[PDB]
Amino acid sequence: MLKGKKAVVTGSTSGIGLAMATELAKAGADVVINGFGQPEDIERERSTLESKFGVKAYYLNADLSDAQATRDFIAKAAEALGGLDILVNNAGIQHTAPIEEFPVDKWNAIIALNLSAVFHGTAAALPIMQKQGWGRIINIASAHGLVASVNKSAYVAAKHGVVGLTKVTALENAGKGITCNAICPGWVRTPLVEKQIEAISQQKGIDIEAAARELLAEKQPSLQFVTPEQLGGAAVFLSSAAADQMTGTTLSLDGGWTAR
Amino acid sequence: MLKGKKAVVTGSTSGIGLAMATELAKAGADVVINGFGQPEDIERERSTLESKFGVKAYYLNADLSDAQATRDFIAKAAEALGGLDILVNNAGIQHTAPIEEFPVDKWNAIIALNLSAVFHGTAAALPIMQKQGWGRIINIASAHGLVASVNKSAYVAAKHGVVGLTKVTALENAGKGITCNAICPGWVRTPLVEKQIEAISQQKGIDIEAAARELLAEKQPSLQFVTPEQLGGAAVFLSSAAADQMTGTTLSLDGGWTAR
Amino acid sequence: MLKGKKAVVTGSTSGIGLAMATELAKAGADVVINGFGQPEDIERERSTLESKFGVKAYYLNADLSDAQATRDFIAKAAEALGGLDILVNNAGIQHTAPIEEFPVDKWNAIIALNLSAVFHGTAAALPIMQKQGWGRIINIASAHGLVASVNKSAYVAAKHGVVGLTKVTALENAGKGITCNAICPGWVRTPLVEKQIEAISQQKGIDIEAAARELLAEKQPSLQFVTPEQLGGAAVFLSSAAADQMTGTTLSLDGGWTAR
Amino acid sequence: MLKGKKAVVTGSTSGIGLAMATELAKAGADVVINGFGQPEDIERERSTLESKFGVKAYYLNADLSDAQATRDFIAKAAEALGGLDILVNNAGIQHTAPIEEFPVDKWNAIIALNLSAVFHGTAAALPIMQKQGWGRIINIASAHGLVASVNKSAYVAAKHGVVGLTKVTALENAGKGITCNAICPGWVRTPLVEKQIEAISQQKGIDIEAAARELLAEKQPSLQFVTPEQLGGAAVFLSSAAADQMTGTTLSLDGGWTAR
Ligand SMILES: NC(=O)c1ccc[n+]([C@@H]2O[C@H](COP(=O)([O-])OP(=O)(O)OC[C@H]3O[C@@H](n4cnc5c(N)ncnc54)[C@H](O)[C@@H]3O)[C@@H](O)[C@H]2O)c1
Ligand SMILES: NC(=O)c1ccc[n+]([C@@H]2O[C@H](COP(=O)([O-])OP(=O)(O)OC[C@H]3O[C@@H](n4cnc5c(N)ncnc54)[C@H](O)[C@@H]3O)[C@@H](O)[C@H]2O)c1
Ligand SMILES: NC(=O)c1ccc[n+]([C@@H]2O[C@H](COP(=O)([O-])OP(=O)(O)OC[C@H]3O[C@@H](n4cnc5c(N)ncnc54)[C@H](O)[C@@H]3O)[C@@H](O)[C@H]2O)c1
Ligand SMILES: NC(=O)c1ccc[n+]([C@@H]2O[C@H](COP(=O)([O-])OP(=O)(O)OC[C@H]3O[C@@H](n4cnc5c(N)ncnc54)[C@H](O)[C@@H]3O)[C@@H](O)[C@H]2O)c1
Ligand SMILES: [Cl-]
Ligand SMILES: [Cl-]
Ligand SMILES: [Cl-]
Ligand SMILES: [Cl-]
Ligand code: NA
Ligand code: NA
């Protein structure tokens, strides 16, 4: 249980980040959520965290592709919470194309959000954690932080970068009561992946669920998606005392992806 | 919670394995323990699991350096428990010397226990798990399954072997409800490590606690030992639903060892 | 021998890149060099390649922190050479500081040059190599593309990114006659490292050569620098037929850094 | 060129080891070959090395699954050569079956040859190299020393073990003029792989060359076999001065296998 803890989850209006926020709230943490979406949906999400789980929840809109906005977001989050114990750097985007066709603006956007925002968020959070002598920074990388696939140059580069940055963060704060680790999921059926399933279905001329099976079979030996709830559970484990000496490392929940 | 589950922990009369057995019993699992020691100590350990935690506990003496004894041990364990849900392949030994001086009998003994017993135990357990469509095989490797140190040829080879074997086990049983992962601890202050601290203290002419600090500083950026209780917690996480799609991978609790 | 081949080496006015250009010229390749420095030194370098080794050499000044300048540089290089067979993405910078103090402009500059320029250069080169059905892209990463050190967040992130990007490039061009690999040096005594030796010497109050020994001892088990000439040799190997099926991987010349 | 050098290649009567011996002889090294086969074929191989390449060649029959025979083989090899500069630990076998069906005798045989012989050969060679202050130990691991496939428990365990042992050897002899590295091939069309192609062809009901294409497509993005000649070239590179500070690491020639 994380009763009293103060958590921030970037990109928590959808997908994995939404489940992270839910699992941290369930465990007793106050939570700042963040990301894009319909205002009515986001306010329902925020108010739900409070009314279900009896914690405080805040939504702070910040486009984390901007460095100063990211650093300002962390300051505003810490002010809202009255502290900052757990930072989950989760927000991310995807774009698929071969390198020689890969849009320069998409490279920049993916590096900005998927890598640089992790740096800027970490930089802003660390002094708060260092002063209190406890912290968790939990970076959501990918199996694509450890291995590659075709047509994902920017994303694989960014996620490999996050895995490196995780190690540095850990080493710089070794022994201080602050850990930093990277959760490296395989496929999780969010909108980020549904777009890729749709693309396969159009390429192959097959129904969406046949396409989902093809997407899994290529990469993920279990032939089952990882769930957002499972990843929330992993984050709660990383936040626990059992993980006090788990730092600078990757926690792969990927159905066997990286085993082969 | 693991209520109803049936667990086997090899080398659980000391050190990490003893804490594993305790944490699994606390979670509600019946437990088979195993290993060498004083009969009075082992029976106190066994009876303690039952009287504290209200589970069934059995001690089965088997020297797991022998293949047939290991396979027979798993059969006897499953018979005692009435099943076998969770196998923790933990028993291990250490011997330090440079390669050209490394005793051939010590190479054989370390390979037999630290690697081959993991194969034989896994082979015996798998058909039981496959029939029921659920299982956890949790191999205790090391940071030395991922990187090396001097004067540990056999041990590093064995532990790298365990990490490879873990991946194969996972892949062969992908999707079946059975996962296999390797917990890779850094330094944990058990008798296996106390011998090495003592050796440093004699080499350097320093007290034992100064030697322990030197042993940590060389390898483990946090400058803190990993605890058996933390590793028990990791095993309980691996045994949980959150880890259903965690398979074929390493879970490093090593204070930053492998980050640098 | 690489007789007839057409090579481009970024950041080849100093250090490792200068030796790369020399070794490729020695092997018979025409070479485009690139980077900052004194005009008289750079023209001596260029004319030396021609007069010693009997190849054609061109200097193209381009600040590769700019995407369009990098893509334009590759076009101009290919025009000068009459082709483009081998691209060595080598230019890089360093800055050391803890994350919470790490200048945002230095993060941006290191990501721009050490990572993004590798993407932009690769993107520009690939269509030329794809049309001819042969190519080598040789990325100069680091041991810090595989592991981390303190106070090098941007650099470690970038170099991990390069290692990921290398894998994608390889996979996208698998079987086409084009390979992409990352050379991952340990310490090499260039100006990039001499600054860090100087910083250690000031911190510890020791002479420069004692500081160099300390810098090695921390990271590099051989206690010897890797040389630019050795790395040139590695590049010539990667460019050879023996390495036709070496692709998507790292070639560590690091004196044992990543073994422990 | 390796003129004057004295090399030993285990399992060099077939496949990769035969090409290793050839490439080392071409470079000017005297060579000891080893392995099973028809006496007339082996003597033709031995005499061919001498008559083509003008070096001395010796065949020493030793079953390297036996520790003492392996240590005695190295002594006899060094006596024949008048030294020992380069040891290539190459001999290996394969057997495919799921873990719960995997013959205990095959596990033992694969561990004995593919792992333990590397230890025993290294142990015997090292004192010779240490006395002269120069050496190369080149271990032939596999992509299966880094990742896994189904039905190869023993082999993957052994090859992961070799990769670990390589690191220890390197670290123990860091700075001494002795390096140790592991060449990690992907598929190479030797008899060891032809058996597996034949098995696929029977399973799928397809001709042998269609089966070979299937075997490649599953694992090896280039869709081309690695050749024994390429691997010989890699060994000659590792034996060169350019590789003086390459130690404790893996050299993957695997057509992209480990990139994804
Ligand atoms: N889905 C998968 O299979 C998978 C696998 C591995 C890793 N990941 C990673 O998990 C993380 C979450 O991905 P997801 O699958 O839940 O995707 P998603 O698209 O469902 O959610 C992305 C979240 O990020 C937010 N967001 C996007 N751009 C933003 C910006 N500029 N600033 C602030 N917030 C922003 C979105 O509004 C949303 O809340 C990403 O880092 C992704 O790379 C996903
Ligand atoms: N202590 C550390 O720092 C550390 C770090 C990483 C991994 N490990 C691993 O953790 C595992 C447990 O080690 P530990 O530190 O608790 O050591 P330990 O010596 O305290 O415990 C070893 C256990 O194995 C048992 N055992 C020994 N030989 C046996 C045999 N032939 N058959 C059956 N049981 C046998 C012992 O009786 C004991 O119960 C080992 O695999 C070790 O390699 C330990
Ligand atoms: N020196 C080491 O120990 C070491 C170790 C591992 C990797 N590396 C890598 O090797 C590569 C070369 O480093 P080095 O040690 O030779 O450093 P160096 O400073 O000697 O050389 C850097 C080169 O890059 C050029 N350069 C710098 N900024 C540039 C820009 N914006 N555009 C174009 N060119 C630019 C410089 O003019 C110079 O030619 C770098 O990528 C570095 O990260 C170095
Ligand atoms: N072929 C591949 O695709 C591939 C890929 C990666 C690694 N490897 C490795 O390359 C090495 C050589 O394999 P190969 O494909 O050339 O196989 P191969 O069967 O063609 O050659 C094996 C060699 O080892 C010898 N040998 C076998 N048992 C022996 C024993 N007990 N003592 C002494 N010598 C013995 C054989 O006589 C033969 O000379 C092996 O270690 C193998 O694991 C092969
Ligand atoms: Cl792919
Ligand atoms: Cl060491
Ligand atoms: Cl460090
Ligand atoms: Cl497989
Ligand atoms: Na892989
Ligand atoms: Na390391």
Q: What is the DSSP string of C181-226?
A: EEEEE--B-SHHHHHHHHHHHHHHT--HHHHHHHHHHHH-TT-SPB
- Largest Cα separation within chain C, whole Å, is 57
Q: In what order do the strands lie in the sheet with B135-140?
A: B57-59, B30-33, B6-9, B86-89, B135-140, B178-185, B250-253
State the DSSP H helix or E strand holding residue B179, giving kind and residue range, or none if neither. strand B178-185
Question: What is the Å distance from ligand 1's center to A219 Cα?
Answer: 20
CA dihedral A249, A255, A256, B2 (to 10 degrees): 70
How far is residue A25's CA from residue A4's CA, in Å, rounded to a whole number? 10
| Residue in the block written with tokens 């290919």 | C78
Show the 3-state SS of B157-178.
Answer: HHHHHHHHHHHHHHHHCCCCCE
CB atoms within 10 A of CB B127: 15
DSSP one-letter string for A126-167:
HHHHHHHT-EEEEEE--GGGTS--TTBHHHHHHHHHHHHHHH
Residue C207 amino acid letter: D
Question: Could you give the CA distance from residue B180 to residue B168 in angstroms, rounded to a whole number?
Answer: 9
Indicate the residue of D123, D145, D153 with minimum beta-carbon distance to B102: D123
Nearby residues of D14 by Cβ (< 8 Å), 6 or more positions away: D35, D37, D190, D191
Distance, CA of D61 to CA of B196 (rounded, Å)? 41
Nearest to C171 by CA among D184, D255, A96, A158: D255
* Distance in angstroms (rounded) separating the CA atoms of residues C119 and A161: 14
Q: List active site positions of A.
A: 155
Rounded CA-CA distance B45/B38 in Å is 11
- One-letter amino acid at A82 equals G
Q: Which residues contact D34 (CB under 8 A, 6 or more apart)?
A: D8, D9, D10, D11, D12, D13, D17, D59, D60, D61, D62, D64, D73, D77, D91
Task: Scan residues 102-161 of B and list those with Cβ closer than 8 Å to C.
Answer: 147-149
Near ion ligand 9, which residues have CB within 5 Å? A 147; D 147
Residues of chain D with C-beta less than 8 angstroms from the C-beta of A151:
none
Interface contact A221, partner B, CB < 8 A:
yes
Residues with CB under 5 A from ligand 7 (ion): B 260; C 149-150
Q: In what side-by-side order are the strands of the sheet with A250-253?
A: A57-59, A30-33, A6-9, A86-89, A135-140, A178-185, A250-253
Report the Cα C78 to chain-centroid distance in Å. Answer: 19
Amino acid identity, position C151: N
User: What residues contact residue B130 under an 8 Å CB cut-off, 6+ apart?
Assistant: B173, B176, B178, D100
Phi, psi for residue D121 in degrees, rounded to 5: -65, -45
Q: What is the Cα Rg of chain A in Å?
A: 18
Q: Do A151 and C172 touch (CB under 8 A)?
A: yes
Strand segments, DSSP code E, in chain D are 6-9, 30-33, 57-59, 86-89, 135-140, 178-185, 250-253
Phi, psi values for residue D111, rounded to 5°: -60, -45
Alpha-carbon distance of C190 to C212, in angstroms, equals: 12
Which ranges constitute the DSSP H helices of chain B? 15-26, 39-53, 67-81, 104-111, 117-132, 153-172, 191-204, 208-219, 228-238
Which of D130, D160, D218 to mutate to test binding with chain B, by most B CBs within 10 Å of its CB?
Answer: D160
**Nearest one of C169, C94, C77, C185 to C130, comparing CA atoms:** C169
Q: Is the dihedral of CA D238, C155, C117, C123 positive or negative?
A: positive
* Residue type at B175 in one-letter notation: G
Who among A104, A163, A165 is closest to C67 (CB)? A104
Contact C124, C172 (CB under 8 A): no
Q: Mutate which of A18, A116, A192, A229 to test ligand 1's pocket (most atoms within 8 Å of Cβ)?
A: A192
B219 near D CB under 8 A: no
Cα–Cα distances (Å) from C18 to C32, C184, C230, in that order, read 11, 17, 12
- Take residue C210 and report the two structure tokens written for it: 């004692």
Least CB–CB distance from C230: residue in D170, D245, D248:
D245
Nearest to B254 by CA among C120, D97, A179: A179
Q: In 10 A of CB A1, how many CB atoms?
A: 11
Task: Give the H/E segment covering residue A67.
Answer: helix A67-81
If you ran DSSP here, which 8-state letter would residue B116 be given?
A: I
B18 in Cβ contact with B5 (< 8 Å): no
For ligand 3, whether the C-beta of C64 sits within 6 Å is: yes
Q: Using CA atoms, how far apart are residues D121 and D12, in angstroms rounded to an integer?
A: 15
**Model resolution, angstroms:** 1.5
Distance from CA of B167 to the nearest CA of A (A): 5
Q: Is A13 annotated for ligand binding?
A: yes
List chains adjacent to chain B, taking adjacency as at least 3 C-beta pairs closer than 8 Å. Answer: A, C, D
Distance (Å) from the alpha carbon of B24 to chain A's nearest alpha carbon: 14
How far apart CA B192 and CA B146 sit, in angstroms, is 19
CA of C125 to the centre of ligand 6 (A): 42
Q: Ligand 4 mean position to D90 CA, how many Å?
A: 6
Residue B21 and residue B48: Cα distance in Å, rounded? 11
The answer, for B246 touching chain C at a CB cutoff of 8 Å, is: no
Method of elucidation: X-ray
Cβ atoms of residues A178 and A136 within 8 Å: yes
Angle at B115 between CA B110 and CA B119, to 5 degrees: 145
Contact D113, D67 (CB under 8 A): no
Asked whether residue A10 is marked as a ligand-binding residue, the answer is no
What residue type is assigned to position C41 of the chain? D
**Measured between CB atoms, does C258 come within 8 Å of chain A?**
no
The alpha carbons of chain D give a radius of gyration, in whole angstroms, of: 18
Instruction: Please report how the helices B153-172 and D153-172 are oriented relative to each other, as an axis angle in degrees rounded to 10.
Output: 150
Task: Provide the phi-psi class of C256: left if phi over 0, else alpha when psi is between -120 and 50, else beta.
Answer: left
Give the domains, in start order, of chain A with CATH numbers.
1-260 (3.40.50.720)
**Amino acid letter, A83:** G
DSSP, collapsed to helix, strand or coil, labels residue B139 as strand
Q: Among candidates C223, C151, C150, which has minimal Cα distance to C187?
A: C223
- Which ligand is the nearest neighbour of the Cα of D89? 4
DSSP structural state of residue B38: -
Contact residues for B136 (Cβ-Cβ < 8 A; gap 6+): B85, B86, B87, B178, B179, B180, B238, B239
Which chain C residues are Cβ-neighbours of D237 within 8 angstroms? 237, 242
| 3-state DSSP assignment of residue D139 | strand
R_g over Cα of chain B: 18
Which residue CA neighbors atom 34 of ligand 2 most closely? B35
Whose CA is closest to atom 31 on ligand 4? Answer: D63
Interatomic CA distance for residues D128 and D126, integer angstroms? 5
| Beta partners for residue D89, in sequence order | D139
Q: How far is residue D139 from each of residues A36, B164, D86, D167, D170, measured CA to CA in Å?
A: 53, 17, 11, 11, 11
Burial of D50 (0-12, 13-18, 19+ CB in 10 A): middle
Rounded Cα–Cα distance for residues D19 and A65 (Å): 53
Cβ pair B90, B12 in contact under 8 A: yes
Choice from B160, B190, B215, B231 to test ligand 2 binding pocket (greatest atom count within 8 A of CB) = B190
User: Which residues lie below 8 Å from residue A79, measured CB to CB, with a gap of 6+?
Assistant: none
Q: Which of D259, D185, D189 is nearest to D221 (CA)?
A: D259
**Helices first, then strands: H and E counts in chain A:** 9, 7
Which candidate, D232, D8, A193, B83, places its Cα nearest to that of C242?
D232
The one-character DSSP state at D147 is S
Element (H, E) at A202: helix A191-204
Q: Which of B112, B71, B108, B75 is nearest to B91 (CA)?
A: B112
- Let me know: does B228 contact B22? Beta carbons within 8 Å: no
Query: What angle do helix axes C208-219 and C191-204 make, rounded to 10 degrees?
Result: 100
- What's the sign of the alpha-carbon dihedral A158, A163, A165, A169? positive
Closest CA to D156 of B145, A114, B98: B145
**Chain B CA closest to residue C144:** B260
Structure tokens at A100: 């020689």
Q: Please answer whether residues A178 and C187 qualify as being in contact, where contact means their C-beta atoms are separated by less than 8 angstroms.
A: no
What is the spatial distance between Cα D139 and Cα D121, in angstroms, rounded to a whole number? 10
Q: Which atom of ligand 2 is nearest to the CA of B141?
A: 7
User: What contacts D136, CB < 8 A, 6 or more positions away?
Assistant: D85, D86, D87, D178, D179, D180, D238, D239
Atom of ligand 2 nearest to the CA of B191: 20
Task: Tell me the three state secondary structure of residue D31.
Answer: strand
Of D47, D228, D154, A34, the residue nearest B122 (C-alpha) = D154
- Are the beta carbons of D253 and C243 closer than 8 angstroms? yes
CA–centroid distance for C37 within its chain: 17
* CA distance linking residue A122 with residue A109, whole number of Å: 19
CA B73 to chain centre: 16
Q: HSE-up of B163 (CA within 13 Å, CB side)? A: 31
Q: Which residues lie closer than 8 Å to D174 by C-beta, 6 or more apart? A: C221, C222, C223, C255, C256, D247, D248
Q: How many CA atoms lie within 13 Å of B33's alpha carbon, on the beta-carbon side?
A: 33
Contacting residues for D91 by C-beta, under 8 A, at least 6 apart: D10, D11, D17, D34, D35, D64, D113, D117
CA dist., res. B105 & res. A53, Å (int) = 59
Nearest residue in chain C measured CA to CA from A152: C168
How far is the first Cα of chain A from the last one, in angstroms, to the nearest whole number? 35
Q: What angle do CA A222, A225, A228 make, to 5 degrees?
A: 135
